[PDB]
Amino acid sequence: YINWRMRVTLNDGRQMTGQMLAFDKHMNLVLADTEEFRKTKRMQAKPNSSTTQTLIQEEKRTLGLTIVRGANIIALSVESPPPTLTAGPGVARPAGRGAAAPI
């Protein structure tokens, strides 16, 4: 499953997605073109509605080539897949069906 594009759940609930390159016995991941995904539960209170909207808003960050330790990994999830025949000795030429037998 080397080079498959994967998403990683971090210890503090963060997400680390991108193109994984390597792993070892301690489950430490070399992960290319990495995007860190963060969730915060905001109480967006509209000025007209008294009910504060509970919304888990999403914020982005780019890091590139990353190396995460296995002591802080939780789970490993699939994100997405990564983004000799010789010629013959035969010949071809025009031909006709010959003279059909007149029946």
Partner: protein, 90 residues
Amino acid sequence: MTSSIGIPIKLLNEAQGHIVTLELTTGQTYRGKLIEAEDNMNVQLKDITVTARDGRVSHLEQIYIRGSHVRFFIVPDMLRNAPMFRSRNV
């Protein structure tokens, strides 16, 4: 069964002399030149601009950080093309 050094630790050994950014599990973020690295992820750095979640912006020189207290490094993009990531045909 000789203890082979893992590819992540090999990439960390490649990353010395470059500018790396370390995020710890104890809340600190360091941007600095990786001077020294070990097989158990203990790292000695030079430049280290500091950034935490509570906003502890500071600058100083020389640090030793143990590998158990860290979460993850970020290393330059060009280290993706290291020779360790090319499959040696055996």
